[PDB]
Design a protein around this ligand. Structure first.
Ligand SMILES: [Mn+2]
Lengths: 528, 518
């Protein structure tokens, strides 16, 4: 009976290895085995509906990247929006930002801090997805009720547009990341993105290995569930200024230290200064004054500057060898190198400038982001660098930086509304911006908050007009334009599936019903 | 609880309820139960729900509107972004069952307006909007107070606390369900709720066909149960009664004599019962259109009529002397009486029993054929009035004459009755009415006493329109669409939300953090 136990195990391990050899995974590094995955499984395998959508999303993005084109979309609020988006956009984005103000699982709104319960964004995914599935059924019923020659004038909308959803930073430790991933897969996510900030928190990043572990945790949970779920890695290193801890050597090139040995450690100072009553913007001015005085820099620059100013001969020679031996090495090894080339230990204190929470100062910018992107690359299907402004030159630089090492790496891009597409750009450049970016390998792009803003705008316009000219505003600003533009929803009973469900009930009750919603005198006959 | 007193606590709480019920809020309200009965259903942890504050405010608003023959008007709200923009211009909010069905089922399974979502659905939407209203109200107080008085003049001063009126459908089941649903609504934030005289299980949008009503007494019971639960909880919650009688053609049962004048019967004694025909047709394989035609022409042959009309018809056609006289006396003695009693009158006046069978035309579910219309609706509304704070009749068109006819009908009996009106997008407004009348329709209806009016589905359609428009343009000219169609009209009309970090409360929470950290 444990005979079978082992055979069942081996056969399922074999099935997983076969799956893993599929082209979906050719750019994917797994730091675990099929045996380890399968032994985490139970005996009731499930093929999740979302898996179909993950596979669909993969083919789309593969297609786009190969043709150096882009799929682009925006953050969707709710099902009405998603049924209209489905006409023109081939993917759907679910935004953590929009969810915080609009869809917290506990109904408590607030700013974008990822401090809603973590059910929030997965629930919204299920919200939209379940609606997509419904309208898909609705439409198949309507199309199949007439012969194919009479279908040319019927809508043929693809409602099954793959959803990509915000996973924030994973909402806790690695086991939270896996449970969160699990939720997403069962709710309908085709893909999720996870960013290298620290939860509960200038932005604060986590060490490179910690985000890598997050990505591995996502993949592992997907593997356990048999899902082709896409994982998108986002880095906030472009504008980040802080780092939670310093134990990852791949980070050491971007950790800023104090080069001023006169200074008392910042935390000790701020602590003492808070006792003395002193507070508010005066503590903040102390911190700023201290930081300025500290002449922050990387260890490598600190070594080069010390070389430039000290008693040494052949200064260009010492520098080039220090670079040759120390760059991209841990700080502990860079120090040993420097001591042996300089005959002394130069002064460099990266603990002194730490914040009240113990965060290290980070040299953020495009370089930092590229360094992180390259390390994340084999653990994610696409990479995304959060952008301060829509800067094409910077987008080119990040793309080149990543592609110099991973030329096939799919990129994602945030076309953000926090920008001002007016002062940032003239009109014809705006019209081509997505297409130009697509050339660089940005194959999936999105406006995080367009759902928020379109809703805000129409609601303010209509409510205002409504309160001034009454019912006339409805005809003029809503219903007549719906009619002229042949919007779906204007015949709202049909759109909502009234016919679909009448036909359902008639099927169970002998082909007729005394209480058919769309019979007799529905007032939708007032609409052509 | 210690005994010895127990009665004392009971009798002091009873007095408090009696004092409460004497407030002018209740001057038109009939309660068929006592304060003693209500208090003895309570526990020992009384709660004043936040929704009660909103109910009192809504009441104050509607009193003012009706007394001045003006109206508050609003529309169905989808989600919090919408409600923060509505708040600037509209002093109430509507939460729609229709919209909830397509966009907010508690189980995420959408569908047409049949109230077949879990009944948690519309209360959850009420809470969704209300928790957001509360939040933005907090956000704004912090923002305004953070500067001194003399420089708040330009700051936003939006009233986010707009009272919510919510859709209770038919009550989602029996009276114990109605009370549990009412309880939810009250704890979620409702200032008022509406409930209609349809049967659950068959419930339709008012502008769908196939509507089945319940007896007048059953809807009365629903309304009393709502009030009882509000009374148990100490809320001033408004209750709005909706009747679907204007277009309904069916009735769930005929037990209530107040319905009898509107129930259609067969006058053809040659016919077998319709259902028996249907059963035989089905039992031998007939279905679909073939089955429907059997029903259709059976109904034609049956010459459907009310019993009163059948009596008049029989007088007109029979051997009688002084036919105007018997008609006079019949109408008089039979009006508003049960069918049983009206039959007895007709037998006495005519000397024989005329043929009349309203069982015979019943549907396969056992529903009766109803003679719907404005008269049927006025009858129901007049009966509902002592049990609700406003009345609403669904109509097929935005028709001023019928709206007036309904108002006159109700006010003939209850001159001070608040009315509500559905400004329905199920109407094609362009064909139903000229633009110059559209602009005055609300004001004109308010003169009749329509003091609360609402566009049920404007949330749906506004979102649908701007979404189709933007997604289309976006798909063709990319980010240019975003600057043109969204961002710059936003900046131009000074929409709140354009500064999205601030609008969302970033400053509010930042200041919270600073407070609990330093
Ligand atoms: Mn409704």
């Amino acid at each position: 009976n444990p005979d079978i136990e082992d055979e069942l195990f081996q056969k399922e391990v074999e099935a997983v290895k076969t799956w893993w050899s599929d082209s979906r995974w050719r750019q994917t590094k797994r730091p675990f085995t099929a045996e380890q995955i399968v032994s985490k499984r139970g005996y009731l395998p499930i093929d999740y509906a979302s898996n179909t959508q993950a596979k669909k999303l993969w083919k789309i993005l593969e297609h786009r990247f190969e043709n150096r084109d882009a799929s682009y979309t925006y953050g969707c609020l709710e099902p009405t929006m998603v049924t209209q988006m489905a006409k023109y956009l081939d993917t759907v984005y679910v935004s953590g930002w929009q969810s915080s103000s609009t869809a917290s699982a506990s109904d408590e709104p607030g700013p974008d801090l990822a401090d809603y319960p973590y059910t929030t964004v997965p629930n919204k995914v299920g919200h939209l997805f379940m609606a997509q599935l419904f309208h898909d059924r609705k439409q198949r019923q309507e199309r199949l009720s007439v012969p194919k020659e009479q279908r040319a004038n019927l809508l043929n909308i693809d409602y099954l547009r793959p959803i990509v959803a915000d996973a924030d930073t994973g909402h806790g430790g690695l086991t939270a990341v896996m449970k969160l991933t699990k939720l997403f897969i069962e709710k309908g996510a085709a893909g999720i993105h996870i960013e290298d900030q620290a939860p509960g928190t200038g932005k604060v990043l986590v060490p490179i290995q910690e985000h890598i572990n997050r990505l591995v945790a996502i993949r592992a949970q997907a593997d356990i569930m048999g899902s082709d779920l896409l994982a998108i890695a986002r880095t906030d290193a472009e504008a980040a200024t802080l780092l939670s801890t310093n134990i990852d050597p791949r980070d050491h090139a971007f950790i800023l230290g104090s080069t001023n040995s006169t200074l008392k450690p910042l935390n000790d100072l701020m602590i003492a200064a808070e006792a003395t009553g002193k507070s508010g913007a005066e503590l903040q001015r102390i911190e700023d004054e201290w930081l300025a005085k500290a002449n922050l820099s990387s260890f490598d620059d600190a070594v080069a500057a010390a070389i430039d100013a000290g008693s040494f001969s052949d200064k260009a020679g010492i520098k080039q060898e220090y670079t040759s031996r120390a760059k991209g090495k841990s700080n502990f090894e860079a120090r040993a190198v420097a001591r042996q080339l300089l005959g002394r230990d130069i002064f460099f204190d990266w603990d002194a400038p730490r914040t009240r929470e113990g965060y290290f100062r980070l040299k953020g910018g495009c370089d930092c982001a590229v360094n992180r992107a390259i390390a994340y690359a084999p653990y994610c299907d696409a990479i995304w660098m959060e952008s301060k402004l829509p800067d094409f030159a910077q987008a080119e630089q990040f793309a080149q930086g990543v592609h110099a090492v991973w030329p096939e790496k799919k990129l994602a891009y945030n076309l953000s509304p926090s920008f001002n597409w007016k002062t940032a750009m003239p009109r014809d450049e705006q019209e081509t911006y997505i297409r130009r970016l697509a050339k660089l390998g940005y194959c999936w792009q999105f406006i995080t908050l367009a759902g928020l803003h379109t809703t805000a705008l129409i609601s303010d316009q209509f409510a205002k007009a409504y309160s001034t000219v009454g019912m006339r505003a409805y005809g003029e600003l809503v219903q007549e334009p719906e009619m002229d533009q042949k919007v779906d929803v204007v015949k709202h009973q049909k759109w909502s599936g009234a016919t679909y469900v009448d036909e359902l009930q008639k099927m169970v009750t002998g082909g007729i019903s005394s209480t058919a919603a769309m019979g007799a005198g529905v007032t939708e006959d007032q609409f052509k």
